[PDB]
Amino acid sequence: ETLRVSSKSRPNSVAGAIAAMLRTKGEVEVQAIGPQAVNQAVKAIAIARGYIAPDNLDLVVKPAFVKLELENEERTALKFSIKAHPLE
Numbered sequence: 001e002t003l004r005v006s007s008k009s010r011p012n013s014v015a016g017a018i019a020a021m022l023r024t025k026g027e028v029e030v031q032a033i034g035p036q037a038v039n040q041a042v043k044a045i046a047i048a049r050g051y052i053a054p055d056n057l058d059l060v061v062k063p064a065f066v067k068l069e070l071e072n073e074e075r076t077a078l079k080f081s082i083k084a085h086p087l088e
């Protein structure tokens, strides 16, 4: 499942969505275009570790480049493939 983050996204809100998906599907992908959206995305993933720790879960991430579209042009974006790992 994919979650898109922009420069105005709120880290905590996105983190909650990452957490919910990690608890259900066990994985999720986060995509962002540009420095600010990427920054907000990293913060969100970092915060998401705090939401799932209580559920005995942590996560690992793998970044990659991916071509997406921003108002119909093609743009190079960064995506984070996130996987949940059990702590016990």
Ligand SMILES: [Zn+2]
Binding pocket: 058, 059, 060, 085, 086
């Ligand atoms: Zn692990």
